[PDB]
């Protein structure tokens, strides 16, 4: 037992040293107030991953991002989608601002079997403007088309982005401390299914060529079907984030970032997301860049 409460102790400070590490590099100040999220991950003693997340818009770099996975291998999702809901509730209660929650209720909203959750994550975008501030939520279901048509109706709606439903799990909220709230579905394509005729017929056909060529690299793709119908988000997990650099053209804000990780004590993988049409520029302007880090006993 004396093992475990040194362990504990050590895995709630590695949480935090991973979050300042991420703040210490890119924001001279914490961004306010992302102690009530240091609060949150330390006591989650569960197993976890922590992502920290850069999203660069030409010389912009907004850095207050911060999301947990609930990894726990007892899967008590309706326990840790609780925890996720009181800490939200703090930040509302400490800020002193009223989340809107309509869109996740209603998806939860007709009895939700939470046995079919694979994956649960709550977390931060955090801004000097208050209002432009957020909470977050990610969702992957499985073997849920019921709830697969619910995320479908609360969105944008039908077609087109409708052209990929059957390739939906992932759902992701956004909560804005104005009170505006969004839902967004997520298309995806695994590994394995990357150089089948159908899925080149059904998914591929419908990008440009620049799109297809990081999947060389990843060992997954996401589209996001309701946001940007112009122009949609592309997610690619990266097997190694060193090989950001051979895939995306970076600017001189995204190569900062990428030079800060390269060495970094961290999780080998990484997800890059950019709209569609910065992988047919000569050079990216806008990325979103998440990398991971794992806390277990
Ligand atoms: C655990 C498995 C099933 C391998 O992951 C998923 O396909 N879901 C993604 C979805 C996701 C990724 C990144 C995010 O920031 C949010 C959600 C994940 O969790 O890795
Ligand atoms: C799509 C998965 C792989 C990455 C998390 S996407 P997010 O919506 O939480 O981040 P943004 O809203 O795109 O900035
Ligand atoms: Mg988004």
Redesign the pocket.
């Known amino acids: 037992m004396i093992v475990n409460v040194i362990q504990k102790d050590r895995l709630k400070e590695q949480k935090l040293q991973f979050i300042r590490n991420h703040q210490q590099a890119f924001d001279v100040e914490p961004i306010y107030p992302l102690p009530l999220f240091e609060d949150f991950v330390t006591s989650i003693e569960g197993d976890c991953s922590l ?1 920290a ?1 850069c999203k660069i818009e030409s010389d912009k770099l907004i850095a207050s991002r911060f ?1 947990l ?1 609930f990894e726990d291998k007892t899967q008590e999702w309706q326990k840790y989608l609780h925890q996720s809901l009181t800490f939200f509730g703090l930040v509302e209660n400490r800020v002193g601002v009223k989340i809107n929650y309509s869109l996740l209720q209603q998806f939860l909203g007709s009895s939700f079997d939470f046995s079919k959750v ?2 649960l ?1 709550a977390g931060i975008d955090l801004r000097n403007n208050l209002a432009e501030s957020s909470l977050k939520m ?1 969702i ?1 279901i499985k073997d849920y088309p019921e709830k697969l048509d619910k995320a479908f109706a609360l969105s944008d709606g039908a077609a087109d982005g409708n052209y990929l439903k059957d390739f939906v ?2 759902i ?1 909220f956004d909560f804005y401390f104005n009170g505006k709230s969004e839902i967004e579905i ?1 298309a ?1 394509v ?1 590994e394995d299914d990357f150089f089948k005729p159908e899925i080149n017929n059904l998914v591929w056909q419908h990008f440009p060529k620049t799109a297809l060529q990081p999947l060389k690299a990843s060992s ?1 793709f ?1 589209t996001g079907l309701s946001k940007a119908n112009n122009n949609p988000v592309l ?1 690619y ?1 990266l097997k190694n984030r060193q090989d950001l650099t051979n895939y995306f053209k970076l600017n001189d804000t995204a190569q900062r970032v990428h030079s800060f990780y390269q060495h970094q004590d961290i999780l080998p993988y990484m ?1 890059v997301g950019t709209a569609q049409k910065e992988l047919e520029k000569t050079r990216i302007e806008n990325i979103r860049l ?1 990398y991971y880090k794992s806390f277990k006993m």
Do not use: P
Request: no cysteine.
């Open positions: 992502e997340s999301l996975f694979t994956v994550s990610h992957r799990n992932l992701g997520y995806e695994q997954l996401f997610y997990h997800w998440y």
